């Protein structure tokens, strides 16, 4: 019972919701995303600098 | 006292003539999402000539180029809302169509009433004494005569009168001497013809009323106002201060009061000559816009619509015989505090009227209703868990006054 849609950008899906407050007579939108991160093995990467 | 029929009893209705007569053409679909909340139209130019007897005069005192504006804007919202316990409402009242009929009528009635207030607040010209009602043929003919005398041709004149006044004219018409068609129509249907005295006379019962507002004392202007065309080339309104009033009264001058300047006359706008009303010259008048009070010492500062331009550097824009200066004597038409329903007269190109389309409100059920060319947006929702449904109706209007000197009020004279 709320207008919504899905958009795609560079392999990521964003959900758009449109809703309004009737008494105040205001129209508004929100864009949402939910990420998730995992670290498999710490011994396979790090920070590198120019050694002296 | 238990069973109820499915047909409602008939009710009362007003009439629409003002919206149909006012100019609904110039301002139509120009207040969009691009222009903003206001838009302006241009004003015509005027020129003046010089009188010399020689010819190699390529270097002399020449005219100037000044352009005016007429701005139109939007008004407030006309919102009517209802709430109900929807099951109790639907006990015997199906499809929620019963509310639809008497809400568009309310919307239109309020629109027309405030439009009438706008016109009587912005009109400048006045005729006759407010006390006397309309009884004879000259009382209607004088409006057309004045409008012709000023010099307006491009446009279409009109006049509006109440129901009781028309019967008085129909009764006068029944006493004619040779027009069988006219006497027959007046005797049977009591209907006056379309063109009455050179102007179109209309009958309307929905018409706003105004209270005069208490005033007392010989009023006069204390300070010379600025009525130069450079100052008043955008609004045709000006602020003036008056003395000789009552000690301290709130609401000394209401909205719509007409102030007459005794020693300054109108001008035929083209030939730039004064106006002669058979026995006396016609005096200049202005209309109060906002309520004005009085402080101690009888000093009243008021803002009036309609300007007595007497610029001396741009003589081509003069519209009065002489300049208003300090010590001039002024009057206010009417009695102390009586309330009356004025009768109107105006040209086509006097004021405009338009409507702003309203888009759908997000995630809310809505619909559109049409009524004499007006579109009303209806929204329905159920805010709160009180099991109370809510509906709202929306309409937004836009109004413009093209030239205050092309309309006003008129009464009868003894």
């Amino acid at each position: 019972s709320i207008d919504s849609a899905v958009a795609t950008y560079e392999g990521f899906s964003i959900r758009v919701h449109k809703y309004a407050d009737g008494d105040a007579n205001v129209q508004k939108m929100r864009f949402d995303l939910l990420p998730a991160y995992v670290c498999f093995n710490p011994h396979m990467g790090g920070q590198f600098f120019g050694n002296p | 006292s238990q069973i109820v029929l499915k047909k409602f009893l008939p009710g009362f209705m007003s009439d629409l003539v003002l919206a149909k007569t006012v100019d609904r053409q110039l301002l139509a679909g120009e207040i969009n999402s691009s222009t903003g909340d206001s838009v302006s139209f241009k004003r015509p130019h005027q020129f003046s000539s010089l009188r010399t007897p020689t010819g190699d005069i390529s270097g002399q005192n020449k005219n100037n180029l000044i352009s005016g504006k007429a701005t139109g804007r939007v008004g407030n919202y006309i919102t009517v809302a209802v709430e109900y316990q929807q099951l109790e409402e639907a006990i015997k009242l199906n499809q929620l169509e019963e509310i639809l009929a008497p809400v568009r009528q309310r919307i239109v009635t309020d629109l027309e009433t405030e439009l009438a207030h706008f016109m009587m607040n912005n009109g400048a010209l006045s005729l006759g004494s407010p006390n006397t009602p309309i009884t004879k043929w000259s009382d209607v003919a004088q409006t057309a005569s004045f409008l012709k005398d000023l010099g307006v041709n491009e446009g279409e004149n009109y006049a509006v009168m109440d129901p009781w006044s028309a019967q008085r004219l129909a009764d006068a018409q029944t006493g004619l001497h040779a027009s069988d068609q006219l006497v027959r129509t007046a005797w049977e249907n009591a209907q006056i013809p379309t063109n009455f005295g050179g102007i179109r006379a209309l009958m309307s019962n929905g018409l706003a009323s105004r209270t005069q507002g208490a005033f007392g004392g010989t009023l006069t202007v204390k300070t010379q106002p600025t009525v130069t065309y450079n100052a008043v080339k955008d609004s045709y309104q000006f602020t003036v201060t008056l003395t000789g009033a009552t000690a301290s009264v709130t609401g000394f001058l209401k909205a719509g009061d007409q102030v007459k300047f005794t020693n300054t006359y109108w001008l035929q706008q083209q030939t730039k000559q004064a106006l002669y009303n058979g026995a006396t010259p016609i005096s200049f008048t202005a209309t109060v816009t906002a309520d004005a009070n009085s402080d101690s010492g009888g000093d009243v500062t008021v803002t009036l619509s309609g300007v007595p331009i007497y610029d001396t550097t741009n003589p081509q824009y003069n519209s009065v015989s002489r300049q208003v200066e300090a010590g001039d004597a002024v009057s206010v038409v009417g009695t102390a505090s009586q309330t009356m329903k004025p009768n109107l007269f105006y040209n086509k190109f006097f004021c405009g009227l338009g409507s702003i389309p309203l888009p759908k409100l997000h995630s809310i059920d809505s619909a559109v209703a049409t009524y004499e060319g007006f579109s009303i947006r209806v929204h329905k929702y159920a805010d709160g868990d009180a099991n109370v449904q809510k509906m709202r109706f929306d309409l937004l209007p836009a109004y413009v006054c093209f030239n205050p000197h092309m309309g006003g009020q008129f009464f009868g004279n003894p």
Binding site: V6, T8, Y9, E10, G11, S13 | -
Partner: protein, 50 residues
């Protein structure tokens, strides 16, 4: 380097392991253009030939 288009169609109730696909699109347009026609009119073997 390799750049691919996106329309968000994969990852949809499937166990995906093959990330070695690059999506390329062929695009078709129709245009209204100006062309010049030359009419050969050799009498031998038919005259009008545009």
């Amino acid at each position: 380097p390799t750049s691919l288009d996106v329309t968000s169609m994969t990852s949809w109730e499937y166990n995906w392991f093959g990330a070695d696909v690059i999506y390329i699109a062929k695009y078709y347009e129709v245009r209204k253009e100006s062309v010049d026609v030359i009419s050969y009119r050799h009498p031998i073997t038919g005259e009008i030939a545009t």
